[PDB]
Amino acid sequence: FSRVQIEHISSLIKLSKADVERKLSQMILDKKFHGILDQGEGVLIIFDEPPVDKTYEAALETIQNMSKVVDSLYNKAKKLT
Template sequence: RDFKTAYSYFYEAFEGYDSIDSPKALTGLKYMLMCKIMLNLADEVQTILSGKLALKYQGPEVEAMKSIAQASHKRSLAEFQKTLVQYKTQLADDPIVNAHLKTLYDNLLEQNLCRIIEPFSRVQVQHVANLIKLPIDTVEKKLSQMILDKKFHGILDQGAGVLVVFDETPVDKTYGNSLETIQNMGKVVDALYHKAKKLT
């Protein structure tokens, strides 16, 4: 997903709609802000909103995006969820924004979980759920997904309700180096064969 390119298209649309005083300019502005948030440039949202063109579009749509940007910048799941409830009409009812908010929420959740489990080699899943203030089944499901996606190395011992985190093992480069050596030897043998063939 190329949010940089999307941002420039939305900016052009915003300027165009603004020049003819179309209400669609607000939608363009909203999507511009969404692009900045998705690019992890949430701190630039305030800069855009304090610009000359954007000042006249202050309202619940813009406040919703500003609140999402702040939650994203702080990496606060609680603030993010509070914003989703407070600005449901402006966020969840817009299918484009809603789709990207789900991705953003997943990223925030992963970042927070990684930060919480980082100091542990073995931790109760219930303790992680308490720290992140989410139901244990949600945390368990996300942790297992992260293990499968290789976000970290570990196992979930569901019987004991424990997450066991392994140290990341360094990749052994011997196999790759051996393959490269064999390929190079093959090239040398081929070259010698062609030289020998020319001599006969």
């Protein structure tokens, strides 16, 4: 269950809320646990939007395509001088 209260999820894990909030947030620090907690109302919500794949393809192309035009700087600026 994504959205859950912190006190009764600490009742399922049988632990105090202080080190439940800090360990769960430590799991968010590890990125293995997708989600975040809420201290104000004592809520914990899980949400994810995994795929970056298209940005990886884009960046891989264009970032190297910089050096591509740098490689064309050699030939096309050689005919000038």
